[PDB]
Swiss-Prot record, chains A, B, C, D:
Belongs to the N-acetylmuramoyl-L-alanine amidase 2 family. This is Peptidoglycan recognition protein 1. It comes from Camelus dromedarius. Pfam families: Amidase_2 (PF01510). It is found in: Secreted; Cytoplasmic granule. Residues 28-156 form the N-acetylmuramoyl-L-alanine amidase domain. Disulfide bonds join 6-130, 22-67, 43-49. Keywords: Antibiotic, Antimicrobial, Disulfide bond, Immunity, Innate immunity, Secreted, Signal. Homotetramer. One of its GO terms (cellular component) is extracellular region. Gene3D superfamilies: Peptidoglycan recognition protein-like. GO terms for biological process: defense response to Gram-positive bacterium; detection of bacterium; innate immune response; negative regulation of cytokine production; peptidoglycan catabolic process.
Length: 171, 171, 171, 171
């Protein structure tokens, strides 16, 4: 019994999320993390980023008809992590081959022509360390770009270039 | 049917495509058409557009490990249609709910800030008429934007605005 | 009352059902359909299948003490659908996690060593199309086996194998 | 095959029908529906009703020398619809003025002194809704009795009295 308080995660309730209808679970420990971007507007305050998480969920639930926002976690330029489907529920973010064997994290913004600010990158890397510490991720997890597994520009040229330098990145 | 009975399509061989390994079939007549963009470079000559189709296939086959280019057909700004998986083989373009019940056509380019030239739009609309005439599509088929069924900017703001005016578009 | 109600369902009165005491409602549109079997006798005539629906209700009401037959609808090998709790009332068929978010349809018989006849399968698939058309089910609904959500042999090996081939099945 | 049901029709092969030789087509959308009875034996099980459809076809093909059973659809007291010539092929049921502009549905039995059971009537009304939904019938279609267009007792006094109460009936 080794309890970490590792999570500085904004919970669903705090960003005023609609209730999830999703039921399918991931088998922990998970081996893969897929990094994407939302390609929408960016935010840099907790107030605007909470609104942005709502908007992203609203799009996936109301328009696309999904059970919840597709990503397991979202990352703001405010420096905070927003709880999506979390560590235990299967996401809808990288297609049916990868969705069942991965955690999908998405940076809120468009990173074709912009880098995320250092605090966003810290939030993301720390989130992953927390995942390992809980047993949600494998200690030898592997990070993929969204474009490495699906046909897309995501996670953005600038952000893609960055994640390639990460220790756990695998092409 | 006066032999062919429609369509000026560049065949796989002509654009120098790798052989397809895909086996799964669509049930004709198909009800849905999903319009996307490649989000890559655009071309405006048969020589450059044939190369572009190769590049798109190369990405899907060599990197993503797919059986063939994901789209059923591609549209060039040269005014020609490039044969993808065609009318009969299931595509990999709009996820596992839509892939089995739809034809996916993709315009080669990024149409966020650009409209396709009239000849591209003609090629696409004519391709669809040919589909109905063959019995590949239902006479009352419905056109969706890629963004209407998956979380994405595709098919681009400008092109999305255009397809919304089409007779067969359904929100 | 002039209902534009889809499909040919045998109403409660016609199969001589006891009056329901159930009051709790589902939130439409519903996302999930759970397929089970009764594991009892099969019938292949309207006269015997009406009797079978009575017997199934009798068991759930008199012995198990439930407010009505547990299933929303039952399917006969006669090729007809028997009205259970219907589209709007919560069922008692797949436990307390799934009962409030699903429609439960049950085939009358034991399908471990037997397939339902084609007309039973048609009745069931048509019933579901009717559900979507009324707004009772979501257009992107998902079909689960009873065994996929509870520890059970239901809906039978043979029938389970069949529902796996359905378009809306999700594991 | 190809047709994924609609309102649960027993297909030609399932009732073991001889292959149709008919070639003349109706122009959809059709305006008229003529209701008749076979004036033969009634059946109330899928097994007996499948046999009855065979017998009716056998009479029209072997003795009368027709290309197929004359009716577009037949209705059983088992509660099921039997596929005749279907929605697109011209029937032989109400003479040469009406045959080219109508769908002919026939109840299997003699309804002079007998009413069809409610499930037969439901099957018929549902079949017609399916017709409108497919574009085979006009949304403002009109229902005639066989006796309203030809000199005959068909569709039987009891059944004639009933169809007169229908919303789309026109004298």
């Amino acid at each position: 019994e080794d309890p970490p308080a590792c999570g500085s995660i904004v919970p669903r309730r705090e960003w005023r999320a609609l209730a999830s209808e999703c039921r399918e679970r991931l088998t922990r420990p998970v081996r893969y993390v897929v990094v994407s971007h939302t390609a929408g507007s960016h935010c840099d305050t907790p107030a605007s980023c909470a609104q942005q998480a709502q908007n992203v969920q609203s799009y996936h639930v109301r328009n696309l008809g999904w059970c919840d926002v597709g990503y397991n976690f979202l990352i703001g330029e405010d420096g905070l992590v927003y709880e999506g489907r979390g560590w235990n529920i299967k996401g809808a973010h990288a297609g049916p081959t990868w969705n069942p064997i991965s955690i999908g994290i998405s940076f809120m913004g468009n990173y074709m022509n912009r880098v995320p600010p250092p605090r966003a990158l810290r939030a993301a890397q720390n989130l992953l360390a927390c995942g390992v510490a809980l047993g949600a991720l494998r200690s030898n997890y592997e990070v993929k770009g969204h474009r490495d597994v699906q046909p897309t520009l995501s996670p953005g040229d600038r952000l893609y270039e960055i994640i390639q330098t990460w220790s756990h990145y695998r092409a």
